[PDB]
Symmetry: D2
Subunit: 116 residues, 4 copies
Amino acid sequence: CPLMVKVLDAVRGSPAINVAVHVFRKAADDTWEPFASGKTSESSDSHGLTTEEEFVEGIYKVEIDTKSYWKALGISPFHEHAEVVFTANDSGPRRYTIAALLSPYSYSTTAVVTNP
Amino acid sequence: LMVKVLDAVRGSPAINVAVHVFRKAADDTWEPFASGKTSESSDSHGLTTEEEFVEGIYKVEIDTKSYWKALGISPFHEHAEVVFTANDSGPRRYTIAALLSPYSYSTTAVVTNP
Amino acid sequence: PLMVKVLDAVRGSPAINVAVHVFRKAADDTWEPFASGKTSESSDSHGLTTEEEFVEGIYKVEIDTKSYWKALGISPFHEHAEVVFTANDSGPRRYTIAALLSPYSYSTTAVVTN
Amino acid sequence: PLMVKVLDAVRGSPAINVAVHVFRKAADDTWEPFASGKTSESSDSHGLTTEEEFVEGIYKVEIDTKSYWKALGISPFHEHAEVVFTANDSGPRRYTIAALLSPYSYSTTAVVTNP
């Protein structure tokens, strides 16, 4: 698939399941367009939210509700949420894997961009 | 509020990195709060702001993009941000440490009883 | 059973043809070969997947990150990337070890399933 | 010349009293102890500052991340965290190894300055 948002829980060493993820495309006057949304789910090595629509050149935003994830575990995380804002400047068809490694006081996000 | 930024490709502190701040408004939108850039001098490798810190939902942006472009590298992220609630339970001393690479970054909060 | 992913944080892509050797501890400072090979790429497969199953015990994953960088004209800080851990201490599990490489930095994450 | 700073990504604070054992590659390709220490906190200086000074060569820094996590009732993935590297290969330089820790993940970054 064209887009894969993986969310990992670094305390537990498991995919953070049931996490809300909102994907947005930038528009005129900072207007953010809703591109795709959903929640993390797994089966074998698929531990995230995937979408089928490819990414045409532009600026996208990925919102991850990391606050809600930690509250369910009785924890008040530092970050109010996780946000990944990037440019899909390669207009040609590309595959984007976006990962977020979560900890109560820290998060990491990594992107792997491959061209089929 | 302190913000330390490290460059993982050069193994040194991210020099002259732009950093902006935003205090949340009653419309769930943002309003500017503070600014500055990562200034280097010995062991001081971050941006140390002076502005006192009201309780409230904040947003710290680090212009990673401009930083990498200047190094002839085309980065993935437009920027690196950290949205956190600041002093909702007495004064707290914050230090936001960021580790940067063209395709990934980590932001870690170090909170301390002032 | 075991999957080792190696990513280049500077290019945002799998680091391919990277040598990975896995060992099992047999005594203080004594490692038995478990499996080895190179990161192979093909569509969504960007790492090294081994067929061998772990038995309970301590294992070491050696990743030759130095050769990867030298092949680029870069003299990296780390001589290699080692990952030592205890496996199956609670039963048959699937391990996915990820190593993210930057010339002056590297991070390793582990995802253990079911 | 050699400093080791460790952050706890779970508690959002430096990792205090983390054991750190530095070795030096021996002529016969072995590991001879080089430094002794535990992350000490004072002011914001939480890491460990070793007095010993190096000469060109390969070194190994082992951070007992496991004892740290166990003390917090958490069974971590790694037996430890280590950083092997060739130092002063092009002239004496100052090194600071920053380690960011979580039970199932960790990173180590080298901040090398030109004296």
